[PDB]
Amino acid sequence: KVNSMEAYQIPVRSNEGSGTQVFGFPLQPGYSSVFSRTLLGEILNYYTHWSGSIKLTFMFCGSAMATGKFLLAYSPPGAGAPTKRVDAMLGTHVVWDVGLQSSCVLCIPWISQTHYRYVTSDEYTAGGFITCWYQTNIVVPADAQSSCYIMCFVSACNDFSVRLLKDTPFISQQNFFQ
Protein backbone atom coordinates (compact mmCIF):
# COMPACT_ATOMS: atom_id res chain seq x y z
CA LYS A 1 0.00 0.00 0.00
CA VAL A 2 2.99 2.37 0.18
CA ASN A 3 3.37 2.19 -3.61
CA SER A 4 -0.14 3.59 -4.02
CA MET A 5 -2.39 6.36 -2.71
CA GLU A 6 -3.94 3.65 -0.50
CA ALA A 7 -1.45 4.29 2.29
CA TYR A 8 -3.44 7.46 3.01
CA GLN A 9 -6.93 5.94 3.30
CA ILE A 10 -8.32 4.61 6.59
CA PRO A 11 -10.90 1.98 5.56
CA VAL A 12 -13.99 2.14 7.79
CA ARG A 13 -17.17 0.16 6.99
CA SER A 14 -20.52 -1.18 8.35
CA ASN A 15 -20.17 -4.37 10.48
CA GLU A 16 -22.46 -6.48 12.76
CA GLY A 17 -20.54 -5.50 15.96
CA SER A 18 -19.76 -2.53 18.25
CA GLY A 19 -16.46 -1.61 19.90
CA THR A 20 -13.92 -2.81 17.35
CA GLN A 21 -10.72 -0.96 16.43
CA VAL A 22 -9.96 1.12 13.35
CA PHE A 23 -6.25 1.91 13.64
CA GLY A 24 -3.51 2.49 16.22
CA PHE A 25 0.07 3.76 16.35
CA PRO A 26 2.54 5.18 18.89
CA LEU A 27 3.26 8.85 19.55
CA GLN A 28 6.69 9.21 17.94
CA PRO A 29 6.47 12.15 15.53
CA GLY A 30 9.84 11.52 13.92
CA TYR A 31 10.73 7.85 14.38
CA SER A 32 7.59 5.83 13.66
CA SER A 33 7.04 4.91 10.02
CA VAL A 34 3.63 6.58 10.16
CA PHE A 35 5.05 9.97 11.16
CA SER A 36 8.66 9.95 9.96
CA ARG A 37 7.74 11.24 6.48
CA THR A 38 5.15 13.98 6.99
CA LEU A 39 6.32 17.60 7.01
CA LEU A 40 6.48 17.52 10.81
CA GLY A 41 8.51 14.31 10.85
CA GLU A 42 10.80 15.54 8.09
CA ILE A 43 11.55 18.70 10.10
CA LEU A 44 12.01 16.63 13.27
CA ASN A 45 14.57 14.31 11.71
CA TYR A 46 17.00 17.28 11.64
CA TYR A 47 16.71 17.82 15.44
CA THR A 48 17.67 15.63 18.47
CA HIS A 49 14.84 16.82 20.82
CA TRP A 50 11.15 17.89 20.54
CA SER A 51 8.44 19.31 22.88
CA GLY A 52 4.84 20.39 22.59
CA SER A 53 1.34 19.33 21.63
CA ILE A 54 0.20 17.59 18.45
CA LYS A 55 -2.92 18.07 16.34
CA LEU A 56 -4.49 15.12 14.47
CA THR A 57 -7.40 16.11 12.15
CA PHE A 58 -9.65 13.33 10.74
CA MET A 59 -11.90 14.01 7.69
CA PHE A 60 -14.76 11.65 6.65
CA CYS A 61 -14.76 11.00 2.88
CA GLY A 62 -17.86 8.83 2.53
CA SER A 63 -21.30 9.65 1.21
CA ALA A 64 -23.48 12.49 2.45
CA MET A 65 -26.03 9.84 3.47
CA ALA A 66 -23.66 7.84 5.68
CA THR A 67 -23.59 8.56 9.41
CA GLY A 68 -21.18 7.39 12.08
CA LYS A 69 -19.66 7.89 15.52
CA PHE A 70 -16.08 7.23 16.62
CA LEU A 71 -13.89 7.31 19.71
CA LEU A 72 -10.41 8.80 19.26
CA ALA A 73 -8.14 8.15 22.24
CA TYR A 74 -4.64 8.91 23.49
CA SER A 75 -3.17 6.83 26.32
CA PRO A 76 0.11 7.82 28.01
CA PRO A 77 2.67 5.09 28.76
CA GLY A 78 2.84 2.91 31.83
CA ALA A 79 0.49 0.20 30.65
CA GLY A 80 0.44 -1.39 27.22
CA ALA A 81 -1.72 -0.33 24.31
CA PRO A 82 -5.42 -0.83 25.12
CA THR A 83 -6.91 -3.93 23.44
CA LYS A 84 -10.59 -3.03 24.11
CA ARG A 85 -12.68 0.18 23.73
CA VAL A 86 -13.40 0.22 27.52
CA ASP A 87 -9.62 0.27 28.28
CA ALA A 88 -9.13 3.09 25.71
CA MET A 89 -12.13 4.96 27.14
CA LEU A 90 -10.11 5.65 30.29
CA GLY A 91 -7.50 7.82 28.55
CA THR A 92 -7.91 11.15 26.78
CA HIS A 93 -10.68 10.63 24.24
CA VAL A 94 -13.00 12.54 21.93
CA VAL A 95 -16.32 11.27 20.58
CA TRP A 96 -16.58 12.27 16.93
CA ASP A 97 -20.09 12.66 15.49
CA VAL A 98 -20.04 12.69 11.65
CA GLY A 99 -22.41 15.61 10.83
CA LEU A 100 -22.40 18.66 8.49
CA GLN A 101 -18.81 19.44 9.67
CA SER A 102 -16.59 16.78 7.99
CA SER A 103 -13.54 17.12 10.31
CA CYS A 104 -12.74 16.65 14.06
CA VAL A 105 -9.49 17.57 15.92
CA LEU A 106 -7.86 15.26 18.50
CA CYS A 107 -5.23 17.30 20.33
CA ILE A 108 -2.53 15.15 21.94
CA PRO A 109 -1.22 17.17 24.90
CA TRP A 110 2.20 17.28 26.54
CA ILE A 111 2.26 14.78 29.42
CA SER A 112 6.00 14.18 29.60
CA GLN A 113 7.93 13.82 32.83
CA THR A 114 10.77 15.88 31.34
CA HIS A 115 10.61 19.09 29.33
CA TYR A 116 11.82 17.57 26.02
CA ARG A 117 11.64 14.09 24.35
CA TYR A 118 14.21 12.39 22.04
CA VAL A 119 13.17 12.16 18.33
CA THR A 120 15.02 8.77 18.04
CA SER A 121 13.60 5.55 19.59
CA ASP A 122 14.09 5.70 23.41
CA GLU A 123 12.19 3.73 26.12
CA TYR A 124 12.99 6.39 28.78
CA THR A 125 11.28 9.14 26.70
CA ALA A 126 8.11 7.06 26.00
CA GLY A 127 5.22 8.93 24.28
CA GLY A 128 2.08 6.78 24.42
CA PHE A 129 -0.44 5.22 22.05
CA ILE A 130 -3.13 6.68 19.75
CA THR A 131 -6.14 4.55 18.80
CA CYS A 132 -9.58 4.76 17.18
CA TRP A 133 -12.69 2.67 17.85
CA TYR A 134 -16.25 2.43 16.46
CA GLN A 135 -18.35 4.34 19.05
CA THR A 136 -21.57 3.04 17.39
CA ASN A 137 -21.64 1.98 13.67
CA ILE A 138 -21.66 3.40 10.05
CA VAL A 139 -25.37 3.32 9.09
CA VAL A 140 -26.11 3.82 5.38
CA PRO A 141 -29.35 3.75 3.40
CA ALA A 142 -30.04 1.45 0.47
CA ASP A 143 -28.31 2.17 -2.84
CA ALA A 144 -25.39 3.82 -0.97
CA GLN A 145 -21.84 2.36 -0.53
CA SER A 146 -21.23 1.09 3.06
CA SER A 147 -17.41 1.08 2.79
CA CYS A 148 -15.89 4.52 3.38
CA TYR A 149 -12.49 6.08 4.03
CA ILE A 150 -11.17 8.55 6.57
CA MET A 151 -8.05 10.70 6.00
CA CYS A 152 -5.66 11.93 8.75
CA PHE A 153 -3.75 15.28 8.78
CA VAL A 154 -0.87 15.96 11.26
CA SER A 155 -0.01 19.48 12.55
CA ALA A 156 1.93 20.99 15.49
CA CYS A 157 0.36 23.33 18.09
CA ASN A 158 1.66 26.79 18.97
CA ASP A 159 3.76 25.42 21.86
CA PHE A 160 5.95 23.11 19.75
CA SER A 161 9.73 23.42 19.80
CA VAL A 162 12.82 21.51 18.68
CA ARG A 163 16.43 21.60 19.92
CA LEU A 164 19.93 20.25 18.93
CA LEU A 165 20.57 20.23 15.13
CA LYS A 166 21.74 16.90 13.56
CA ASP A 167 22.05 15.34 10.05
CA THR A 168 19.00 13.59 8.51
CA PRO A 169 19.31 9.72 8.40
CA PHE A 170 17.32 9.64 5.09
CA ILE A 171 19.50 11.27 2.37
CA SER A 172 22.58 9.18 1.38
CA GLN A 173 25.34 9.26 -1.30
CA GLN A 174 28.13 6.95 -2.55
CA ASN A 175 29.81 9.14 -5.19
CA PHE A 176 29.56 12.84 -6.13
CA PHE A 177 26.47 13.42 -8.34
CA GLN A 178 27.82 14.68 -11.72
Binding site: V94, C157, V162, L164
Partner: protein
Amino acid sequence: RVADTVGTGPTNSEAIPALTAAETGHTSQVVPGDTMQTRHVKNYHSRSESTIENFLCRSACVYFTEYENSGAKRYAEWVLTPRQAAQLRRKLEFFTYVRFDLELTFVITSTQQPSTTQNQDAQILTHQIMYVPPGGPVPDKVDSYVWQTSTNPSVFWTEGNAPPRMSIPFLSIGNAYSNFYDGWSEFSRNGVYGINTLNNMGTLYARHVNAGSTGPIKSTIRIYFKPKHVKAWIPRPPRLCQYEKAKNVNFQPSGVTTTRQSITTMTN
Protein backbone atom coordinates in the same frame (compact mmCIF):
# COMPACT_ATOMS: atom_id res chain seq x y z
CA ARG B 1 9.33 32.05 23.25
CA VAL B 2 6.48 29.50 22.78
CA ALA B 3 2.95 30.48 23.95
CA ASP B 4 2.11 29.52 27.58
CA THR B 5 -0.88 27.18 28.25
CA VAL B 6 -4.13 28.72 29.67
CA GLY B 7 -5.99 26.89 32.48
CA THR B 8 -9.50 25.70 31.54
CA GLY B 9 -12.47 24.02 33.24
CA PRO B 10 -15.54 22.03 32.22
CA THR B 11 -17.89 23.13 29.47
CA ASN B 12 -21.46 22.45 28.34
CA SER B 13 -21.83 25.08 25.63
CA GLU B 14 -22.64 25.32 21.93
CA ALA B 15 -19.10 26.38 20.98
CA ILE B 16 -17.56 23.60 18.89
CA PRO B 17 -13.78 24.19 18.66
CA ALA B 18 -13.10 20.58 17.68
CA LEU B 19 -15.42 20.22 14.68
CA THR B 20 -14.05 22.00 11.62
CA ALA B 21 -13.88 21.63 7.81
CA ALA B 22 -10.49 20.60 6.28
CA GLU B 23 -11.87 21.22 2.73
CA THR B 24 -11.36 25.01 3.20
CA GLY B 25 -7.60 24.22 3.13
CA HIS B 26 -7.26 26.02 6.51
CA THR B 27 -5.21 24.58 9.43
CA SER B 28 -7.19 24.57 12.74
CA GLN B 29 -5.81 26.93 15.46
CA VAL B 30 -7.00 24.67 18.36
CA VAL B 31 -5.08 24.44 21.68
CA PRO B 32 -5.24 21.50 24.13
CA GLY B 33 -7.54 23.50 26.42
CA ASP B 34 -10.42 23.30 23.94
CA THR B 35 -10.81 19.52 24.23
CA MET B 36 -9.87 18.88 27.87
CA GLN B 37 -9.30 20.51 31.24
CA THR B 38 -5.82 21.96 31.63
CA ARG B 39 -3.74 23.81 34.24
CA HIS B 40 -1.80 27.08 33.77
CA VAL B 41 1.80 26.36 32.63
CA LYS B 42 4.38 29.13 31.95
CA ASN B 43 6.60 28.00 29.02
CA TYR B 44 10.15 29.45 28.80
CA HIS B 45 10.96 27.25 25.76
CA SER B 46 12.28 29.31 22.80
CA ARG B 47 12.19 28.71 18.99
CA SER B 48 15.73 30.07 18.56
CA GLU B 49 17.33 26.98 16.94
CA SER B 50 14.51 26.92 14.33
CA THR B 51 15.29 30.21 12.50
CA ILE B 52 16.06 29.52 8.79
CA GLU B 53 19.41 31.39 9.06
CA ASN B 54 20.59 29.26 12.05
CA PHE B 55 19.39 26.05 10.30
CA LEU B 56 21.33 26.80 7.06
CA CYS B 57 24.35 28.60 8.65
CA ARG B 58 26.75 25.61 9.08
CA SER B 59 29.76 24.69 6.92
CA ALA B 60 29.27 21.69 4.63
CA CYS B 61 31.61 19.99 2.18
CA VAL B 62 30.26 20.51 -1.33
CA TYR B 63 33.13 18.98 -3.35
CA PHE B 64 36.74 17.72 -3.18
CA THR B 65 39.26 17.19 -6.07
CA GLU B 66 42.94 16.09 -6.38
CA TYR B 67 46.03 17.41 -8.30
CA GLU B 68 49.71 16.34 -8.52
CA ASN B 69 53.18 17.86 -8.76
CA SER B 70 54.21 15.67 -11.72
CA GLY B 71 52.70 13.98 -14.73
CA ALA B 72 49.65 14.99 -16.75
CA LYS B 73 47.27 16.08 -13.96
CA ARG B 74 49.07 19.18 -12.66
CA TYR B 75 46.03 21.31 -11.80
CA ALA B 76 42.38 20.89 -10.83
CA GLU B 77 39.24 22.61 -12.16
CA TRP B 78 35.64 22.66 -10.79
CA VAL B 79 32.56 24.52 -12.18
CA LEU B 80 30.95 25.88 -8.97
CA THR B 81 27.60 24.24 -7.99
CA PRO B 82 25.91 23.38 -4.62
CA ARG B 83 24.17 20.27 -6.11
CA GLN B 84 27.20 17.85 -6.21
CA ALA B 85 26.61 16.70 -2.57
CA ALA B 86 23.38 15.44 -0.96
CA GLN B 87 23.20 17.04 2.47
CA LEU B 88 23.34 20.78 1.80
CA ARG B 89 21.38 20.29 -1.42
CA ARG B 90 18.47 18.72 0.44
CA LYS B 91 18.73 21.36 3.17
CA LEU B 92 18.59 24.13 0.56
CA GLU B 93 15.72 22.67 -1.49
CA PHE B 94 13.25 23.19 1.35
CA PHE B 95 12.62 26.54 -0.35
CA THR B 96 12.11 27.72 -3.96
CA TYR B 97 14.03 31.02 -3.85
CA VAL B 98 16.86 31.85 -1.45
CA ARG B 99 19.22 34.79 -1.08
CA PHE B 100 22.40 34.69 0.99
CA ASP B 101 25.99 35.81 1.28
CA LEU B 102 28.59 33.04 1.31
CA GLU B 103 31.59 32.10 3.42
CA LEU B 104 34.09 29.92 1.57
CA THR B 105 36.67 27.70 3.26
CA PHE B 106 39.25 25.37 1.73
CA VAL B 107 40.96 22.37 3.35
CA ILE B 108 44.05 21.30 1.36
CA THR B 109 46.03 18.15 2.37
CA SER B 110 49.07 16.67 0.51
CA THR B 111 50.09 12.95 0.51
CA GLN B 112 53.40 11.38 -0.70
CA GLN B 113 52.51 9.07 -3.64
CA PRO B 114 54.65 5.85 -3.68
CA SER B 115 57.73 6.01 -6.00
CA THR B 116 61.14 4.31 -6.56
CA THR B 117 62.93 7.72 -6.41
CA GLN B 118 65.55 7.85 -3.60
CA ASN B 119 67.18 10.62 -1.48
CA GLN B 120 63.73 12.33 -1.22
CA ASP B 121 63.76 15.68 0.70
CA ALA B 122 60.68 17.90 0.32
CA GLN B 123 60.28 21.64 0.99
CA ILE B 124 57.10 23.49 2.15
CA LEU B 125 54.38 23.18 -0.53
CA THR B 126 52.53 26.33 -1.57
CA HIS B 127 49.18 26.19 -3.37
CA GLN B 128 47.28 28.71 -5.48
CA ILE B 129 43.47 28.72 -5.87
CA MET B 130 42.00 31.00 -8.61
CA TYR B 131 38.42 32.00 -9.51
CA VAL B 132 37.47 32.67 -13.14
CA PRO B 133 34.07 34.28 -13.80
CA PRO B 134 32.23 33.38 -17.03
CA GLY B 135 34.12 34.70 -20.03
CA GLY B 136 37.62 34.55 -18.52
CA PRO B 137 40.66 32.99 -20.26
CA VAL B 138 40.63 29.47 -18.72
CA PRO B 139 44.14 28.03 -18.02
CA ASP B 140 45.11 25.45 -20.69
CA LYS B 141 48.24 24.48 -18.73
CA VAL B 142 49.87 24.79 -15.32
CA ASP B 143 52.58 27.24 -16.39
CA SER B 144 50.11 29.45 -18.23
CA TYR B 145 49.99 33.23 -18.39
CA VAL B 146 46.60 33.50 -16.71
CA TRP B 147 47.86 32.56 -13.25
CA GLN B 148 49.03 36.18 -12.96
CA THR B 149 45.49 36.97 -11.66
CA SER B 150 45.49 40.65 -12.75
CA THR B 151 41.75 40.99 -11.93
CA ASN B 152 40.63 37.39 -11.14
CA PRO B 153 40.62 36.89 -7.30
CA SER B 154 43.30 34.40 -6.08
CA VAL B 155 44.70 33.10 -2.73
CA PHE B 156 48.23 31.77 -1.93
CA TRP B 157 48.42 29.25 0.93
CA THR B 158 51.55 27.64 2.47
CA GLU B 159 51.00 24.26 4.15
CA GLY B 160 50.92 24.25 7.98
CA ASN B 161 48.59 27.14 8.95
CA ALA B 162 44.88 27.95 9.57
CA PRO B 163 42.83 27.02 6.41
CA PRO B 164 42.13 29.89 3.90
CA ARG B 165 38.67 31.59 3.94
CA MET B 166 37.00 34.54 2.13
CA SER B 167 33.49 36.09 2.04
CA ILE B 168 31.34 36.07 -1.17
CA PRO B 169 28.47 38.56 -1.89
CA PHE B 170 25.08 37.58 -3.44
CA LEU B 171 26.67 37.75 -6.96
CA SER B 172 23.34 37.01 -8.76
CA ILE B 173 21.80 38.89 -11.75
CA GLY B 174 18.40 37.59 -10.52
CA ASN B 175 16.71 39.12 -7.41
CA ALA B 176 17.02 35.70 -5.69
CA TYR B 177 18.85 32.38 -6.32
CA SER B 178 16.48 29.74 -7.78
CA ASN B 179 16.69 26.09 -6.56
CA PHE B 180 14.09 25.09 -9.18
CA TYR B 181 13.41 26.24 -12.74
CA ASP B 182 10.44 25.10 -14.84
CA GLY B 183 11.44 26.02 -18.37
CA TRP B 184 14.02 25.97 -21.13
CA SER B 185 16.84 28.29 -22.15
CA GLU B 186 15.64 28.89 -25.72
CA PHE B 187 12.34 30.54 -26.56
CA SER B 188 11.60 27.63 -28.93
CA ARG B 189 11.08 25.30 -25.93
CA ASN B 190 14.11 23.11 -26.56
CA GLY B 191 17.64 22.81 -25.25
CA VAL B 192 18.58 22.83 -21.58
CA TYR B 193 15.55 22.11 -19.39
CA GLY B 194 15.69 22.81 -15.69
CA ILE B 195 17.88 24.51 -13.12
CA ASN B 196 21.01 24.10 -15.30
CA THR B 197 19.65 27.10 -17.26
CA LEU B 198 20.53 29.52 -14.45
CA ASN B 199 23.86 28.08 -13.23
CA ASN B 200 26.55 30.44 -14.54
CA MET B 201 28.59 31.02 -11.39
CA GLY B 202 32.05 30.53 -12.91
CA THR B 203 34.93 28.12 -12.47
CA LEU B 204 37.59 27.37 -9.84
CA TYR B 205 41.19 26.23 -10.42
CA ALA B 206 43.90 24.95 -8.04
CA ARG B 207 47.60 24.18 -8.49
CA HIS B 208 50.96 23.81 -6.76
CA VAL B 209 53.05 26.95 -7.11
CA ASN B 210 56.20 24.82 -6.68
CA ALA B 211 57.03 21.14 -7.07
CA GLY B 212 58.51 20.93 -3.57
CA SER B 213 60.26 17.58 -3.88
CA THR B 214 61.74 15.20 -6.48
CA GLY B 215 59.07 12.64 -5.43
CA PRO B 216 55.39 12.75 -6.55
CA ILE B 217 52.91 14.33 -4.06
CA LYS B 218 49.09 14.33 -4.59
CA SER B 219 47.19 17.27 -2.98
CA THR B 220 43.41 17.12 -2.27
CA ILE B 221 41.31 20.29 -1.90
CA ARG B 222 37.94 20.25 -0.13
CA ILE B 223 35.49 23.14 -0.49
CA TYR B 224 33.17 24.20 2.36
CA PHE B 225 30.14 26.47 1.91
CA LYS B 226 28.47 28.49 4.64
CA PRO B 227 25.36 30.60 3.92
CA LYS B 228 25.17 33.86 5.95
CA HIS B 229 22.31 36.45 6.03
CA VAL B 230 19.75 34.04 4.41
CA LYS B 231 16.28 35.16 3.13
CA ALA B 232 13.94 32.33 1.98
CA TRP B 233 10.52 32.28 0.21
CA ILE B 234 7.91 29.67 -0.98
CA PRO B 235 8.62 26.53 1.19
CA ARG B 236 8.53 23.16 -0.67
CA PRO B 237 8.19 19.46 0.47
CA PRO B 238 11.47 17.53 1.24
CA ARG B 239 12.99 15.06 -1.31
CA LEU B 240 11.36 11.61 -0.71
CA CYS B 241 13.68 9.89 -3.27
CA GLN B 242 17.52 9.83 -3.56
CA TYR B 243 19.34 12.38 -5.81
CA GLU B 244 20.86 10.91 -9.02
CA LYS B 245 22.29 13.73 -11.17
CA ALA B 246 23.16 17.28 -10.01
CA LYS B 247 22.08 18.78 -13.41
CA ASN B 248 18.57 17.19 -13.53
CA VAL B 249 15.78 16.38 -11.00
CA ASN B 250 15.49 12.86 -12.53
CA PHE B 251 14.68 10.29 -9.78
CA GLN B 252 13.89 6.57 -9.28
CA PRO B 253 10.30 6.09 -7.94
CA SER B 254 10.12 5.08 -4.23
CA GLY B 255 7.37 4.16 -1.69
CA VAL B 256 5.65 6.90 0.31
CA THR B 257 7.00 5.57 3.62
CA THR B 258 8.16 2.31 5.23
CA THR B 259 5.76 -0.55 6.00
CA ARG B 260 4.58 -2.11 9.30
CA GLN B 261 2.95 -5.47 10.27
CA SER B 262 -0.65 -4.11 10.53
CA ILE B 263 -2.69 -0.84 10.74
CA THR B 264 -2.98 -1.60 14.51
CA THR B 265 0.76 -2.33 15.12
CA MET B 266 2.75 -0.01 17.46
CA THR B 267 6.11 -1.49 16.27
CA ASN B 268 7.68 -0.36 12.94
